[model samples]
Target: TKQRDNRVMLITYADSLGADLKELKTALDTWYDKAVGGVHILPFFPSGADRGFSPKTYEMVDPAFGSFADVEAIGKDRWLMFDFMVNHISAQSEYYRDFLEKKEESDWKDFFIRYSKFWPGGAPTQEQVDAIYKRKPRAPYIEAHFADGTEDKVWCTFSEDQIDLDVSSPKVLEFIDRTLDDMADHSASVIRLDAFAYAVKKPGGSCFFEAPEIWQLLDRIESRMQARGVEILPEIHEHYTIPLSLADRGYWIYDFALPVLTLHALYTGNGEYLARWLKMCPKHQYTTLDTHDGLGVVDVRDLLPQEETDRVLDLLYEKGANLNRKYSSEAYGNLDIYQVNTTYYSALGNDDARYLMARAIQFFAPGIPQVYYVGLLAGENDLELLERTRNGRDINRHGYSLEEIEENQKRPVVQDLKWLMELRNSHPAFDLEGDLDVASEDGHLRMLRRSGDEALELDCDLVSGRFTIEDKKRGNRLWPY
Candidate 1:
């Protein structure tokens, strides 16, 4: 069941929007009260690496960001979504350190997945390694050198610092429960399950969302969170089918395929593909053009033809601002080739008109829209940050000061986005189960959102980026009826 309101969500890092949580709350109150209905604050917990994905613990807030009170203060007025890295914990965490010190004697021994015991042969064979779906080219493991004269292979799927957990173990389930409870207590209306599919791993299997096991895990947590009145949104950037599958089971999912599908529409000046996708995409989901990571390429798989996908992808490098192949290559340590590191604004060459049009389409899509903070400001690629950190994702992760945000708010593109966002939030026609009529012909795309007598329609010229909105009951050319 849905626990949060159906409105635009602002996806922002704790420190990126203004400075910290306190400043963030101020920014929200001052600028985005009506436009944004909720705030999906990216991990504010103490972290070891991976930009807070490798959390040391969910017990406390990262001091640098702010306190739990600050988080709760923001949530009191608006809904909040927090990230929980279901697949792994930080290597610097107490559990991992204690395991390193005591080896098998540690209470947290079963807390992590030890390859030595997970496989029958004390290690996966070459054939088994090849069969598994891994983030690394080779097998996903790191040699854990224990203090007690012992060394063993530890399952490390994403990064060495983000140690994989033995989710199959009862102890891990206990940890998840406590962590989720704590989040709800801290005023989290929704919990975003990061890397959800990779949580369940089976030996010699793809170890990614293994049928019955994955469903069982999801069900267990779902039941627990449902009791606490918190909705779970699983974040997976794979093919669109996988998310659609989750949606069929009544779980909230991310519309990751929208990024590329939208790119194709904007690039070709034809909304045929985008319109088709808009009609079929899950309504119980978040539509995002940009986020903390990058624009997901893999999600667009069959949604757009390979040739057309290739065409849009190539246009990105050639026309997208400050994009380079090396940024997404193994050279920058971004092993996830599935994503391209570039701000959505820059991906469309930072043109205000085109960027605003892209957002208009997203707002009118079937799901709740999430605007990344960078995208909220119509930001450009930060080449300096990218070069300085040597991390590709940094190109889209520029930290904006309060002064910078004020300057950006002056932009017409951002003002236009805010107007569209407010419309999406306040309009009565955007029912999750409402009817969506999409008809595309020539360079014009027409979309209608209707729920009984309440309805809103969008008529747009796809090529020139011009659009108009009308309320079905209010005759014509009327915005506030």
Candidate 2:
């Protein structure tokens, strides 16, 4: 496992911080020193679509971003987590191109899931189509335009540019093992299995987070990464129970539920619901209030009562900053039904105090906090970027230059956030192995984190955003002193 030093982990694109990895290193070392201890840079591999989700290869870092040397420089001091899309590969990848060129004669004939071969009938029956967990309204496939004047369908779970891989094939398993070694050799302490849920396919099953099959796939990956002394974090944004199930197996999981839960707590001034989760959430996990994706709605399923969850969704468009119903709708080319598009700062209506208090709760909550780059600066929605790209997720994915970074530093809220990040990083009371004491009623909440002899307590008002943090053992205030 990466060192559990209670350091704040940052999640950013390779070019989002500055222009590329070199400038990102300079910015993190100078502009955001002690606040950031580890980094989970989004996929910097050569991609064909989905902003980097459709990667061509995992062996080399994209030259547009930098080389492995530049990436290693960032990892020299920080525990780095790299993304490997376990489900699919780029349609433009060498293997896919070869398959398209030579048809059955290609060495990668089995690397892809061809509908001509995947289904027993050469085409999925309507019953089978409705039975399988899929992305499209019809059969989840795209017509592969082969060079031999022949056309056939291949399984495609996401965008057309991303072709789903047949993980059961020997060649694909060879690729998985080879790439795992490459990432481990390049100083990746943790490899996040991107879209692993969709990797395994059972004909009659959901094929999405199926139990025994998914566990078997992890067993394979676990053996590989464990040998390299590297940890694995399976990435999935689904019902909360799915991740909790993963945690039960003694693996690190993501706290995707906290974002909406935090939003709900602040909006309703009710801590009981949030407290309920803190008491039972997995301790060995990465907590994130914001990430490259939008705020997850399905993650909070039964965690919040269905009616209250509905209320939170309604309130986002009613009062959220610069948000529109059409933005996350199909009109904006968003296929994800489980998330709403907006920054965490914007979801809190751009109020600094509320945002800070939310961060405080997350810090004192159960896991290592993963802060998105935009969230690090408390940034608002970038409508200009949204309009330019017409992608809903782009609203929070603004690329900042050095000048933009310097300008954002002038905001008072940004300064306060930096201080909070530093405290979270430097304080011993935030340890993952520590004991958490949570108390809550309707409008207020209190938490105590104790590790060894050091302890700190936070007493907060969920509505008005008034809060205080004090060292429990020292009997002195720690924040707002």
lDDT measured at residue 305 in model 1 versus the true structure, 0 to 100: 89
Model 2 per-residue lDDT at 143: 90
- List per-prediction Cα lDDT, in the order shown: 0.86, 0.87
Estimate the lDDT of model 1. 0.86
Model 2, 348-412: lDDT tens digits are: 89989999999999888888899999999898999999889888889999999877888999897
Per-residue CA lDDT of candidate 1, range 115-223, in tens? 8799987878877888778554646888899998879988988878989998889988999999999888888889999999998888789887789988898998888
Candidate 2 worst ten-residue window by lDDT: 131-140
